[PDB]
Ligand binder design. Sequence first.
Ligand SMILES: COc1ccc(S(=O)(=O)N[C@H](C)C(=O)O)cc1
Ligand SMILES: [Ca+2]
Ligand SMILES: [Ca+2]
Ligand SMILES: [Ca+2]
Ligand SMILES: [Zn+2]
Ligand SMILES: [Zn+2]
Length: 158
Amino acid sequence: GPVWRKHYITYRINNYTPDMNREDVDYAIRKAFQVWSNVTPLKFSKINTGMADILVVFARGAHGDDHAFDGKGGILAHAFGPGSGIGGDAHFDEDEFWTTHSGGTNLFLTAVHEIGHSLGLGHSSDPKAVMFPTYKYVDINTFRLSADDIRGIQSLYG
Ligand SMILES: COc1ccc(S(=O)(=O)N[C@H](C)C(=O)O)cc1
Ligand SMILES: [Ca+2]
Ligand SMILES: [Ca+2]
Ligand SMILES: [Ca+2]
Ligand SMILES: [Zn+2]
Ligand SMILES: [Zn+2]
């Protein structure tokens, strides 16, 4: 399936959840990309204008694609695989309550998983992996990709 065929990848935050401090959204998204560039040759850069490879969006309900959100709970976010246009883009459900911590739904953890999809990774059946199909909070100050997540990404890049 698709992968990015270039090493410098850009992203852009289309808009910001009111759930968080802005700088906290910026840092959570940045840390999430870093998790992946730590184990691949990819470099990620935030641009503020123009067309990014990966558009980061907060939206609720029906939001102009075929992956309508469902209110609070259920689906937290979704992302498109590598490709032009909406390819790569990662959408976060505004009906969730985004946080830097264990309360609500953690944006950083969610963003890690969604960026995995943006890079072309699918799901793992291993509950330790961030790409397990269903969300499970783990302490983010000590967060590490599982060996399973590492083999998956390294089967696509590097
Ligand atoms: C932190 O990882 C997760 C973030 C969101 C979800 S999810 O929101 O339950 N499912 C979407 C469609 C997905 O697999 O991307 C499941 C796991
Ligand atoms: Ca939801
Ligand atoms: Ca895109
Ligand atoms: Ca919200
Ligand atoms: Zn969407
Ligand atoms: Zn997923």
